[PDB]
Write a protein that binds this ligand. Structure first.
Ligand SMILES: N=C(N)c1ccc2nc(C(=O)c3nc4ccc(C(=N)N)cc4[nH]3)[nH]c2c1
Ligand SMILES: [Ca+2]
Ligand SMILES: [Co+2]
Length: 223
């Protein structure tokens, strides 16, 4: 997260770290057996780390659970990153509590101007590299689709929104991939792509989860 702040240990209790020997992507717990993350985060050999604050120190609150199955969206295009979303099933249900909690799926999409919280363990430097060990958080608005589509001509689809600051300085980044964008208590976005991190006129693009609630509900019930 470039230009955000330290969240506070387990203040984002639905945030997950996907680990395959190291953190590589974020995710969101949506109930004790299911995590949603991004399809560009697909790997074979995932361990879902819940209750995390510092991903390099065991601190007492974490639950490490292995994925029993991974389902990438049937129409995911890795060249355009349309339908960038994936579902990961835990081998055993998580124990929910204060520090491990799930996040609600939306009943409708959010409007431009809505404030959201984005969070992750991803890069903090826009021109350069510095990876944090504790969770970073950023408050960012959903932006008008016109200003989304001007910044990226012919690349935005209906399944995508921009959230961020056009002046740059503040953005999601690599390592935050698959993580949450929560607006008004619902999961509205998944950290997907952008151009660099926090560049002026280049905001983050996010998977528009409200278009997928039906595919999610239906896939988790028959799996
Ligand atoms: N090797 C992998 N399995 C891997 C996984 C995820 C990646 N994501 C990227 C990656 O390219 C990337 N994820 C981004 C997320 C947000 C922004 C942003 N500026 N809003 C930019 C990003 N660039 N490379 C990746 C590689
Ligand atoms: Ca830890
Ligand atoms: Co990424």
């Amino acid at each position: 997260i470039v230009g955000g702040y330290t969240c506070g240990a387990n203040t984002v209790p639905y945030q997950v770290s996907l680990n395959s020997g190291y953190h590589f992507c974020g995710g969101s717990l949506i109930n004790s057996q299911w995590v949603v993350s991004a399809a560009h985060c697909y790997k074979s050999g995932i361990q879902v780390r819940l209750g995390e604050d510092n991903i390099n120190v065991v601190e007492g609150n974490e639950q490490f659970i292995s994925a029993s199955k991974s389902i990438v969206h049937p129409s995911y295009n890795s060249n355009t990153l349309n339908n960038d979303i994936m579902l990961i099933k835990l081998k055993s249900a998580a124990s929910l509590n204060s520090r491990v909690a799930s996040i609600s799926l939306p009943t409708s999409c959010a409007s431009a101007g809505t404030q959201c919280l984005i969070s992750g363990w991803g890069n903090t430097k826009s021109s350069g590299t510095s990876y944090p060990d504790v969770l970073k958080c950023l408050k960012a608005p959903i932006l008008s689709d016109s200003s989304c589509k001007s910044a990226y001509p012919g690349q935005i689809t209906s399944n995508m929104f921009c959230a961020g600051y056009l002046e740059g300085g503040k953005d999601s980044c690599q390592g935050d991939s698959g993580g949450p964008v929560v607006c008004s208590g619902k999961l509205q976005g998944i950290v997907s792509w952008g151009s660099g991190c926090a560049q002026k006129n280049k905001p983050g693009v996010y998977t528009k989860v409200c278009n997928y609630v039906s595919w999610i509900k239906q896939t988790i019930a028959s799996n």
